[PDB]
Structure formats: structure tokens, C-alpha cells
Amino acid sequence: VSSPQLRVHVGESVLMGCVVQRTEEKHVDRVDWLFSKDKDDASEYVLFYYSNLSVPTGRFQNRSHLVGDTFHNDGSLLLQDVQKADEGIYTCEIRLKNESMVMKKPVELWVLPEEPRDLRVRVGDTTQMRCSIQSTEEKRVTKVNWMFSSGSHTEEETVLSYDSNMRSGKFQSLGRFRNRVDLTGDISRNDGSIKLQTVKESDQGIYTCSIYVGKLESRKTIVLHVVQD
Amino acid sequence: YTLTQPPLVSVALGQKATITCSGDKLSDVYVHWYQQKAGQAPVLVIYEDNRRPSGIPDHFSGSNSGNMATLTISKAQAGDEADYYCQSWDGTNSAWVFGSGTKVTVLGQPNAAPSVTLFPPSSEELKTNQATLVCMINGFYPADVAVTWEADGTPITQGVKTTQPSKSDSKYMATSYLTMTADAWKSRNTFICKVTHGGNTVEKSLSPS
């Protein structure tokens, strides 16, 4: 009666939840994800699952992934690299082994224009470099690491590394970036956005965010311009 | 190894409460806070120094500077009355460490009178030649109660036992037990348990039954 609504920028990743209460008992028989632009108009399968084999299809072939453990009645969908064309209604239908069906509220996906992708910081100031996937379901992001590389660099540098299975008291930030890099996102809410505290001329370069939902990685890239005033 | 934490912290309703958590170079590592109530599992109320899970009330907030974390309970409610442990990571040894813990008491709560309920010994119990009288006290604040027993105007001391008060959310609850014998029970006119909370003396009668 009221569609959860989800706004994401072109190119970003969305995770669209679909869980019947997670139990240690697989009751999920089938999982179907349908896409529609409006009503009054045909739908197409993003992805359908049955008997421990999922079929990503259509334009979503390369970009759609069944992320939820279906053996735990979690049939959540992860749509990568969202286009404007993907703007519409997404509907999850799970058929239970007891033969009842569970339809989840269709979710309106509103696709916004492309992120800036070109950041301009002023020396000796703080800036933010944001990176996050958006989902109706929390705590799906299993790992986040930011890699820095000046166009010159035949090399990579860890800006900030944070993982679900950390045997540390905090995120890992190496070298130069120590003491300055800091997390502005709530990774539990699938938000890996970071903050750079006291920017120096040498910080200039390309920052790459690799944000993981299991094995599945989504990658962003931000060019940082530093300026002396 | 334990992170330093004040034993008790009081607070009136709606007042601000601040719980500190000290550790060596504590501010080079995330600090998290858990809440624990009477005989309950801990619950994460704040994490990563300065963040809050959905489901936790907005009036919780955390900070971590100068190697001293602080859990702030703005606008304190009676349902915030609990035990709070901070938590972190020792990077010398490789281990997770908790704080000593702080008991947050919430004052400014009103004086509710107790509802008493006196029960007789079950027939099922009398077979044993034992008779237990159960006088239960419910829904009172504050947690101060003295239970006294009688039998035909004669007070019974020995053979009695009264529990320590414990909280239900908006009140405290307790019970007192009087343990007679079969004959002791059935040879005395009227039993009474006298509950005392404040300048009040609630009494409830019991005769053959």
C-alpha cells in the first residue's frame, strides 16, 4: 500500500531485501524478482531462483546477484552499476515449500544523476570521500577498503581498510594517511564513506573504493584536486 | 584487565547522565557501549565511539577523546536504569576488553504503593505435613519493604524468609514466605502478613482454607 522508496545515483549499487524470517530451515522453494517501469505495463524477470540455482536475466544478467542465503530463507537481490533505465518498481515473490506465497512490498527505484566523481579540496582542510551501497537490508556490507594512487603511482596505497572479521580495535589506515583518514559512514548501514582531515598538496590523486557484499565487489573512483590558497 | 568506569551514576528523570570509560591510549581504538538489565543479555547501545543502532533511543550518544570515552544519556528515562559496560580492544595482547561497569540509577520516580496478595498453602503441599504461606508484594516504589508475620496477634519470626526487591520496569516487586508445619497451620485462627512501604502498613488476612 506504500512502496519503500530507494534513490541511488547512476552507476551505484542497490541491494533490495527479500527475507522471510531467517531460520536454520530452508522453506524457500522459489524466489522471483520482477521489474516494471510502471503499472499498466509489462514486467520482466531480473532474476529467478529455484532448486539451488539462480538465473540472472535480461539487462540485469551481468549486474544482478542473489546475495541472501536462500538456505536461510533470505532471497535478497543485489543490483550493481545501476542505470537510469533501471528506474522503476522491483518486486520480490517467494514461494514457500508449504506452498503459501510471500510477496514483499514493491520497491520504487529512483535513479538520480551521476555522482560528481571529481573532488576539489583546499590544502589544510578536511574533505569527505563518500562510498556506499544502499539497501533495504542492513549489515550486508562485509568489507571496505580505500586505495590511493596518484596518476604517477605505479603502485597502490591503503588509505583505509575495514572488515567484518577484524582482529583489530579499529580500521586499518597505513602510512601517510595515518591519523588523518577517518570513517564518516556507518559500515553497518552499508556506508563506507570516509573523511580526510588535514589535506596536503601531495594527497592529490585517484582514490578507489572497493566495497564488498560477500565475494561481490562494487568499485568507485574519485579524483582529488588539492589547491593552495 | 578492565577499563576504568565509575561504580554508580545517578540521574533524575529527564536529566543528563554521563558515563566515562578510561583506557591507555583508548582514543586510538573504537569504543563500544552495552546495556544490561536484571538477568538479561547485554545489548549494544553505542558502537564505534559515536554511533547508534536503530532501535536504541535517540537520546543516547557517545564520544571518545583524550583517552576517555563517554556514554551520554540525555533526557534520562526510567527504562534507562541499567548496567552499562564500555568495551574495546587491547592492542598489546590481542584481546577484546570490557569496562568495570557502571550502574545507572534513575531518580525522580514517584511513590507507588504496593499491591499485596496473600495465599494459603495448597492441599497438595499439606500432605507433606508442610504448610507454606505466600505473601507477594507487587508494584511499589521505592524498593524499601519490611514484611512481618502474625498468628492470632502473635508475631512469627523464625520460619520466615523474605526475598530482596527487584525491578519491574516502573516498580519493584517482592515476596515473603512463611513456613509452618501441617499442624502449625491448622491450629491457628487467622494469619496475617504485614507489608510496610513508607509510613504505610498493608495487611492481608487468612483463615482456614
Place this chain on the structure above:
Amino acid sequence: QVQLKESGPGLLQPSQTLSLTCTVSGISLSDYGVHWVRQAPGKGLEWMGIIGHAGGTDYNSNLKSRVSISRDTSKSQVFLKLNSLQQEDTAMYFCARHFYTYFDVWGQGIQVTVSSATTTAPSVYPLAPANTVTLGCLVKGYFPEPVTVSWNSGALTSGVHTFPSVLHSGLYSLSSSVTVPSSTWPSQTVTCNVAHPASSTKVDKKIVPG
């Protein structure tokens, strides 16, 4: 419904060996590490050890080599085993999920007394009076803690009070009440549902009028 639930013996003699089991439901152990944390009566929370998502284990320095944590992914089951049981191994034992750098989800916990004392089952006696009516249940003379008390298997989802335990002669005693409207209790049969994990006793005692 992501849950951790612990299980095991409630009572043990010294020099025995504790072995708890934590059943992690709704998820897989293959990508989350599980903690074991205990809490001694007087004292606070004490981290015992972790079994990481990868099966690797680390422990508490003080708990050096008489603690043991393993698992079985097939059952989604993480085990604790404690050796050389002394006093103040007596504690609440919790298993908790490890998310990033904190303990996002916790178990209900399990109380484990380490005493010489033999286990004692409670005797369950009903309490009836002798508009709304208040009924009762007297769970008397058990050891050790704890002692569950439901009413109609939890059908009675209100008015149910369970009072604190008294300790006399090495035995514990507990009473529990329930209030229901006039012309319900007579008409419809209320039941008490006591359970004592320790002795493996369960008792459904219907409160007859009196």
C-alpha cells in the same frame, strides 16, 4: 530471525569439565566469528575467547589452556569447553556474534553453577485465592538456578509476574503470579509451566480452585 542460543549443564562439581554449545540460527558460521563471554555473579563481563569465521581461535591470557573453543558448521554450532572447574567458573555464559569490531548480537545466556551440592528438583505447588483474579505458582526447593515459569506455554502474554528467588538451606524458592479477568479462570483452565534445566524437570501444574 538471527539468533544465538546457548545450552548445556547447569550444575557441575569441581575438577569436572564444562562444555557449552551455542546454536547460531539464521546465518552461517563461514563468514562470522563467534565470541564466548562470561559474567561472574559479583564481577562484570569477561571475554574468554573467539572462534573466527575462518575457524581460527584466540583466547584470554588468564584463561590459558583450560579453555577450548571449537565448532561444527554443518550444525551451525559453536562449542565452549572449560577445564579444571573451580569456584567462580560459576557465571552467566554468553555467546555473541562478532561484527567488525564489536558484539552486535548476543545470546540469552546460560547460568552455570559449579558446586559440590547435588541437584535438587523443585516441588510445584499451585496458589489460588481463599473484577480480576490473581493466581499463583510456588516453585519450591530447587538447586541450582535457574527456573523457568510460563503460563499456558506463553499463551498468557500479560500480567505474568515472576518474583525473585530466596535462598535457604542450599535450596532456592520462587513464586510466580498471573492476573486474569473475572469469569475467565473458572470458565477456562489456567496452567502453570515450571521448568528446571538442571535436573531436567518440567512441570505443568494446573491451578485448581481452592
